[PDB]
Amino acid sequence: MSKARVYTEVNVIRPKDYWDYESLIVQWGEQDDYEVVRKVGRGKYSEVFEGINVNSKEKCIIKILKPVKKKKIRREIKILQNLCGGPNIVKLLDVVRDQHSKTPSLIFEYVNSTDFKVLYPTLTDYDIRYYIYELLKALDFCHSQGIMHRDVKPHNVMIDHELRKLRLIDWGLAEFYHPGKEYNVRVASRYFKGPELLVDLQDYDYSLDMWSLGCMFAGMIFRKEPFFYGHDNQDQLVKIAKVLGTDELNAYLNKYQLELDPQLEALVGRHSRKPWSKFINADNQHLVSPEAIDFLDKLLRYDHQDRLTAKEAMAHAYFAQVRAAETSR
Ligand SMILES: [Cl-]
Ligand SMILES: [Cl-]
Numbered sequence: 001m002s003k004a005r006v007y008t009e010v011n012v013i014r015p016k017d018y019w020d021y022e023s024l025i026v027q028w029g030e031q032d033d034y035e036v037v038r039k040v041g042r043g044k045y046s047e048v049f050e051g052i053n054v055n056s057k058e059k060c061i062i063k064i065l066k067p068v069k070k071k072k073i074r075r076e077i078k079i080l081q082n083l084c085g086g087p088n089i090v091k092l093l094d095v096v097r098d099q100h101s102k103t104p105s106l107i108f109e110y111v112n113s114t115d116f117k118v119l120y121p122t123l124t125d126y127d128i129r130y131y132i133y134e135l136l137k138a139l140d141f142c143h144s145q146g147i148m149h150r151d152v153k154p155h156n157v158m159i160d161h162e163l164r165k166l167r168l169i170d171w172g173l174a175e176f177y178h179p180g181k182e183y184n185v186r187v188a189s190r191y192f193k194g195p196e197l198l199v200d201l202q203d204y205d206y207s208l209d210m211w212s213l214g215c216m217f218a219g220m221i222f223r224k225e226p227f228f229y230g231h232d233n234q235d236q237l238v239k240i241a242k243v244l245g246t247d248e249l250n251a252y253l254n255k256y257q258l259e260l261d262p263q264l265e266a267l268v269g270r271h272s273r274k275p276w277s278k279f280i281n282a283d284n285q286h287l288v289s290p291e292a293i294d295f296l297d298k299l300l301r302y303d304h305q306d307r308l309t310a311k312e313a314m315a316h317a318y319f320a321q322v323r324a325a326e327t328s329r
Contacts, residue, residue, distance in 0.1 A: 001203045002256065002304070002305070004207070005205075005207070005305060006143070006206070007177070009179065011176050011178055012179065014146065018146075019176040021074045021075045021078035021176070022071050024077060024078050026073075028095060028096060030096060031105070033053060033094070033096070034053055034062055035052050036051050037049065037050045040061070043155075045066050046063050046064055046065045046170075047063075048062070049062045049064070050062075058110070059110035060093060060107050061107070061109070061111060062108075065104050065105065073104060075174070076174070077106070079147055079176075080171055082147065083141070083147065083171075086141045088135070088137050088168055089141065089142065090108050090158070090168065091108060091109040092106060092107070093108060094107035108169075113160055116225075119161060120219070120220055121223065125286060125287050128217075128287060129319055129322050132217055132220075132319075135168065136213070136314045137314070138166070139152070139168070139209050139310040140311055140314065143177075143206040143310055146177050147175070147177065148174060148176075148205065148206050149168065149171065149209050150175060150187040151174070151187065151189060152168075152188070152192060152212035154219070155189075156170045175187075180203065181203065182202035183202055185198075185202060188208070188212060191227075191230065192212040192226075193212075193233070194304065195240060195252065195302045196211075198233055199253065199258050204304060206309075206310075207304040207307045208304065210309070210310065211299065211300065211307060214300040218279075218296055221288050221292050222284050222288070224284075228240050234263070234264050237264065241271050244273055245273030246271050248302050249268070249302050252302040252303050276296060289318070294318070298316075
């Protein structure tokens with residue numbers, strides 16, 4: 001079976017209580033301590049509000065969970081607790097539930113974000129480098145803690161642009177990496193699904209997040225959102241194969257002893273690899289450098305084992321100036 005290149009044994013060496021989220025005994029706080037103020041966003045599994053702690057008067061984020069199995073809620077809480085206070089990770093403060101409806105809410109430290117549909121079209125070259133580097137800090141940290149996010153996308157990256165603060169949010173799809181485990185492939189969101197999810201390679205690992213990051217990065221530097229625009233999970237692989245080419249897909253399927261369903265094989269067809277330079281135009285040229293292309297190229301590989309790790313990405317020349325600005329302090 002496939003195994004992670006890095007952080008392979010993190011959860012083998014940690015005690016069972018670290019990763020056994022199903023056994024979690026949730027310590028419920030006071031539902032009355034937090035009041036909603038205004039709605040911030042919506043999702044398939046929750047609605048997110050700006051709130052206030054009525055005692056301290058501090059602002060918070062209140063995430064009200066739609067009905068889901070207890071095991072899934074315990075998974076998100078356990079992971080949030082295990083990552084609490086890590087770099088650029090959203091910070092869980094409290095867990096409460098309504099005593100009549102039993103609906104649970106997760107309480108987070110407040111983040112004053114700007115929606116990516118407004119922010120990304122105004123991001124400069126340096127800000128793309130800065131924010132992707134900040135996101136890589138979050139991914140290297142959570143991966144080092146034995147956790148895959150499995151839903152990296154612009155909506156789950158809250159950026160406070162005036163403070164230049166970034167938080168990786170919504171850990172409701174995240175899982176613990178266990179070497180040798182076959183995971184559910186119905187994770188992430190369509191446009192950011194790695195080829196492993198689309199070809200039924202279940203023994204995937206942290207590198208799934210690095211594919212999703214590459215999709216985000218491509219969307220930013222080419223001003224093409226989303227970059228891989230599929231209309232369903234099968235079409236999503238078609239859109240990928242029309243860019244990366246089918247030769248390396250076929251090699252990938254052979255290496256892992258996979259074959260496409262005949263219905264999917266007909267859709268994928270045969271395609272040459274398209275050079276990244278084909279996506280440059282006058283409107284986005286100021287964001288595309290040789291270094292940006294090389295970095296993107298090393299993220300978007302069919303073979304998850306060939307993708308940069310978060311640490312390798314941070315070391316790429318594309319971030320040279322960001323690292324220097326950070327080193328100076
Ligand atoms: Cl799952
Ligand atoms: Cl990594």
